[PDB]
Amino acid sequence: ENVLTQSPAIMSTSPGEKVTMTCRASSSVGSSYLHWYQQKSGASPKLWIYSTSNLASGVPARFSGSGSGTSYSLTISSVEAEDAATYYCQQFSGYPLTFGSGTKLEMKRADAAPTVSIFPPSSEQLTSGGASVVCFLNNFYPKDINVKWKIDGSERQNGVLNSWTDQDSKDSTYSMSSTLTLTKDEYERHNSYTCEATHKTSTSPIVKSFNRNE
Amino acid sequence: DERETWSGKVDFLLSVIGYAVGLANVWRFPYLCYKNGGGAFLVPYGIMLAVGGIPLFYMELALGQHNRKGAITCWGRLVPLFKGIGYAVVLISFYLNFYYNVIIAWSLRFFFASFTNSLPWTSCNNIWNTPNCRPFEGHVEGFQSAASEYFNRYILELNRSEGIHDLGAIKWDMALCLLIVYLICYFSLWKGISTSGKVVWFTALFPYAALLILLIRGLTLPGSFLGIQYYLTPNFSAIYKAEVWADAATQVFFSLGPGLGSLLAYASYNKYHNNVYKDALLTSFINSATSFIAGFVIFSVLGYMAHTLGVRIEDVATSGPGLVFVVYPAAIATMPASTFWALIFFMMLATLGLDSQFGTVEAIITALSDEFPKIKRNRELFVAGLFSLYFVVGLASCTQGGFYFFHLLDRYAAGYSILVAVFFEAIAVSWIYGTNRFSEDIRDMIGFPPGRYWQVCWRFVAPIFLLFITVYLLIGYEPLTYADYVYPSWANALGWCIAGSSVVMIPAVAIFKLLSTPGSLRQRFTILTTPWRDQQ
Amino acid sequence: EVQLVESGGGLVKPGGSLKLSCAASGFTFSSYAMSWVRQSPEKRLEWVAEISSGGRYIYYSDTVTGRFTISRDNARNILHLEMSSLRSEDTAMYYCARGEVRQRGFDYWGQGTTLTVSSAKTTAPSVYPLAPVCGDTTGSSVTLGCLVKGYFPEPVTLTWNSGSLSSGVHTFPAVLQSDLYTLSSSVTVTSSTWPSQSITCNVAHPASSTKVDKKIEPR
Ligand SMILES: CC(C)CCC[C@@H](C)[C@H]1CC[C@H]2[C@@H]3CC=C4C[C@@H](OC(=O)CCC(=O)O)CC[C@]4(C)[C@H]3CC[C@]12C
Ligand SMILES: CC(C)CCC[C@@H](C)[C@H]1CC[C@H]2[C@@H]3CC=C4C[C@@H](O)CC[C@]4(C)[C@H]3CC[C@]12C
Ligand SMILES: O=C(O)C1=CCCN(CCON=C(c2ccccc2)c2ccccc2)C1
Ligand SMILES: [Cl-]
Ligand code: NA
Ligand code: NA
Residue type, B327: V
Convert B493-529 to b/e letters by CB count within 10 Å (16 or more is b).
eebeebbebbbbbbeebbeebbeeeeeeeeebeeebe
Cβ neighbours of residue B110 closer than 8 Å, sequence gap 6 or more: B155, B325, B329, B342, B346, B349
Handedness of CA B166, B172, B177, B181 (dihedral sign): positive
Contact of B9 with B279, CB cutoff 8 Å = no
Q: In 3D, which of B300, B344, B114, B299 has the Cα closest to residue B207?
A: B344
User: Which residues of B fall within a CB distance of 8 Å from A35?
Assistant: none
Q: How far is CA B215 from CA B212, B268, B430, C156, in A?
A: 5, 36, 42, 83
Report yes or no: B210 and B347 within 8 Å, Cβ to Cβ.
yes
Cα gap C181→B359, rounded to integer Å = 71
First to last CA, chain B: 15
Final residue belonging to a domain, choices A107, A131, A159 = A107
Question: CA B225, CA B211: separation in Å to the nearest integer?
Answer: 17
- Report the Cα C41 to chain-centroid distance in Å: 9
The amino acid at residue A84 is A
Q: Is the CB of B349 under 6 A from ligand 1?
A: no
Decide: B38 and B295 in contact? Cβ < 8 Å: no
Q: Are residues A60 and A154 in the same domain?
A: no
Could you give phi then psi for residue B268, rounded to 5 degrees? -65, -10
Separation of alpha carbons C190 and A21, rounded Å: 43
Q: Is the CB of B447 under 6 A from ligand 1?
A: no
3-state secondary structure of B241: coil
Contacts of A80 (CB under 8 A, 6+ apart): A15, A60, A62
State if residue B508 touches ligand 2 by the CB under 6 angstroms criterion: no
- Which residue has the CA at smallest separation from atom 25 of ligand 2? B205
Query: Which residue CA neighbors atom 3 of ligand 2 most closely?
Result: B212
Q: Which positions ≥6 away from B306 have C-beta within 8 Å?
A: B223, B226, B227, B230, B312, B313, B316
Helix, strand or coil, per DSSP, at residue C142:
strand
Cβ distance of B443 and C103 shorter than 8 Å: no
Backbone angles phi, psi at B443, to 5 degrees: -60, -35
Residue of C nearest to A181 (CA): C149
The DSSP call for residue A144 is -
Residue of B290, B283, B367, B357 lying closest to B61 (CA atoms)? B283
DSSP structure class, residue B51: I
Interacting residues of B327 by C-beta distance below 8 A, sequence separation 6+: B137, B147, B302, B305, B316, B318
User: Same domain for A91 and A22?
Assistant: yes
CA of B317 to the centre of ligand 6 (A): 23
Q: How far is the CA of B22 from the centre of ligand 3 (A)?
A: 9
Q: Which amino acid is at B387?
A: F
Q: Residues with Cβ < 8 Å from B203, sequence gap 6 or more?
A: B18, B351, B354, B355, B358
- Mapped onto helix, strand or coil, the DSSP state of residue B180 is helix
What is the fold, at CATH topology level, of the domain defined by C126-215? Immunoglobulin-like (2.60.40)
Give the count of domains, chain A: 2
Between CA C123 and CA C167 the distance in angstroms is 31
Is A136 in the same domain as A50?
no
Any alpha helices (H) in A71-197, and if so which ranges?
184-188
CB C183 within 8 A of CB C158: yes
Are residues A100 and A127 both part of a single domain? no
Can you spell out the DSSP letters for C193-204? Answer: GTTTS--EEEEE
| A83 and A150 together in one domain | no
Q: Which of B443, B448, B534 sits opposite C52 (nearest CB)?
A: B443
**Residue from B205, B292, B355 whose mutation best tests the ligand 2 pocket (most atoms within 8 A of CB):** B205
Nearest-angstrom CA–CA distance, A130 and A115: 27
How many angstroms separate the CA atoms of B412 and B405, rounded?
11
Cβ count near C84 (within 10 Å): 13
Asked if residue B251 lies in contact with residue B45, where contact means CB atoms within 8 angstroms, the answer is yes
For ligand 3, residues with CB inside 6 Å are: B 19-20, 22-25, 96, 100, 253-255, 257-260, 356, 360, 414-415, 418
How many whole angstroms from B288 Cα to the centroid of ligand 2?
Answer: 13
State the pairing for strand pair A10-13/A103-107. parallel
**Separation of CA B480 from chain center:** 21
Resolution in A: 2.8
Q: How far apart are CA C51 and CA C39, in angstroms?
A: 19
**Exposure pattern of B301-336 as b/e (b: 16+ CB <10 Å)?**
bbbbbbebbebebebbbbbebbbbbbbbbbbbbebe
Phi, psi of C42 (to 5 degrees): -70, 5
Q: Are residues A74 and A119 in the same domain?
A: no
Instruction: Give the helix, strand, coil percentages of chain A, each rounded to 5.
Output: 5, 55, 45
Count of C-beta atoms within a 10 Å radius of residue B375: 16
Instruction: Give the domain-ending residue among A54, A83, A107.
Output: A107
**Nearest Cα to A176, choosing from A141, A130, A211, A200?**
A141
Gap between the Cα atoms of B466 and B462, Å rounded: 6
Angle at C8 between CA C6 and CA C12, to 5 degrees: 135
What sign has the CA pseudo-torsion C51, C57, C58, C59?
negative
- Kindly report, as residue ranges, where domains of CATH 2.60.40.10 are found in chain C: 3-117, 126-215
Give the Cα separation of A65 and B524 in Å (integer): 55
Best CA proximity match to B134, nearest among B125, B126, B143: B143
Chain B residues 418-477 within an 8 A CB cutoff of chain C: 436-437, 439-440, 443-444, 447-449
CATH code of the domain in which A170 resides: 2.60.40.10
Max intra-chain CA distance, chain B: 76
Q: Which of the 8 DSSP states describes residue B533? A: G
Beta strands in B449-489 (DSSP E): 481-482, 485-486
Partners of A198 in beta bridges? A146
Q: DSSP code of B405?
A: H
Q: Name residues whose C-beta falls within 8 Å of residue B440's C-beta, 6 or more positions apart in sequence.
A: B449, C52, C53, C54, C56, C57
In this structure, the answer to whether residues A141 and A205 fall within a common structural domain is: yes
Q: Domain boundary at A90, A107, A124, which?
A: A107
Sign (positive/negative) of CA torsion A60, A63, A69, A71?
Answer: negative
Task: Report how far Cα B406 is from the mean position of its chain's Cα atoms.
Answer: 15
Q: How far apart are alpha carbons B59 and B463 in whole angstroms? A: 13
Determine the number of helices (DSSP H) and then strands (DSSP E) in chain B: 29, 2
* Cα distance from N-terminal residue to C-terminal residue, chain A: 63
C-alpha of residue B288 to centroid of ligand 6, in Å: 13
> Does ligand 2 come within 6 angstroms of the Cβ of B204?
no
Strand order in the sheet with C78-83: C3-7, C18-25, C78-83, C68-73
**How far, in Å, CA of B475 to CA of C186, rounded?**
91
Architecture of the domain defined by C3-117: Sandwich (2.60)
- Please indicate, yes or no, whether residues A94 and A135 belong to a single structural domain of this protein: no
Please tell me the distance between residue B527's alpha carbon and the centre of ligand 4 in angstroms: 41
B366 contacts B268 by C-beta, under 8 angstroms: yes
A83 and A67 together in one domain: yes
Rounded-to-integer distance, Cα B367 and Cα B70, Å: 4
Closest-CA residue, ligand 1 atom 16, reads B50
Q: Which of B406, B398, B402, B234 is nearest to B320 (CA)?
A: B406
**Residue ranges making up the domain that contains A203:** 115-211
Cross-strand partners of A149? A195
Show residues of chain C in contact with A177, CB under 8 Å.
170, 172, 184, 186
Q: Do A85 and A50 share a domain, yes or no?
A: yes
The answer for B 100-159 residues in CB contact with A (under 8 A) is none
Is B21 near ligand 2, meaning CB less than 6 Å away?
no
**Residues C147, C151, C155: CA angle, nearest 5 degrees:** 90
Q: Which residues pair with A99 in a beta bridge?
A: A90
Experimental approach taken: X-ray
Q: How far is B300 from chain A (nearest CA, A)?
A: 45
Question: Crossing angle of helices B338-369/B102-113, nearest 10°?
Answer: 150
Task: Say yes or no for a CB contact (<8 Å) between B439 and C52.
Answer: no
Tell me the H-state helices in B77-192. 84-100, 102-113, 146-150, 172-189
As a whole number of angstroms, the distance between CA B151 and CA B130 comes to 13
Residues B331, B336, B340: CA angle, nearest 5 degrees: 80
Query: DSSP 3-state assignment of B200?
Result: helix
A80/A142 same-domain check: no
Maximum distance among all alpha carbons in chain C? 73
What is each CA distance from A128 to A212, C87, C146, in whole angstroms? 18, 35, 18
